[PDB]
Amino acid sequence: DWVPPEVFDLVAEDKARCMSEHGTTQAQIDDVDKGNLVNEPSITCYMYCLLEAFSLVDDEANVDEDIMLGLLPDQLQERAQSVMGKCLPTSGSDNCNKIYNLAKCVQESAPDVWFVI
Ligand SMILES: CC(=O)CCCCC/C=C\C(=O)O
Ligand SMILES: [Cl-]
Prior knowledge:
- The protein is mainly α.
- The protein has a single domain (1-117), classed as Recoverin, domain 1 (Orthogonal Bundle).
- The protein is built from 6 helices and no strands.
- The chain has helices at 6-22, 26-33, 41-53, 65-71, 77-87, 95-109.
- Helix 1 packs across helix 3 and helix 3 (41-53) packs across helix 6 (95-109).
- It binds (2Z)-9-oxodec-2-enoic acid and chloride ion.
- (2Z)-9-oxodec-2-enoic acid is lined by residues 7, 10-11, 47, 50-51, 54, 71, 115-117.
- It is found in: Secreted.
- Belongs to the PBP/GOBP family.
- Keywords: Secreted, Signal.
- One of its GO terms (cellular component) is extracellular space.
């Protein structure tokens, strides 16, 4: 669980662009999924890049919560909305680092569900 496999097809093109743009390796992504976050631009800008690709964030890494909730499964919307109370607004020294700070907040608040694609 829980991401439907269809989402991997849907993000494939943007994922390859984002990894190429930022020098991201799958190993870095697999490590964020296992809960290990580091402030490395190659992974933090990748997370911003992918989020942007789907209008989840804007040009200053403000999260669009309406879009985020509508995109999440109908079950998680409870948790989600609660974690956005704690973790939004995003904060940091640049768009990438604002997403690093977000990621570790959400990792921390919901390890059960936490995931990056
Ligand atoms: C890096 C990460 O997990 C966030 C990407 C979210 C993309 C979801 C896009 C479309 C959908 O879920 O239909
Ligand atoms: Cl700021």
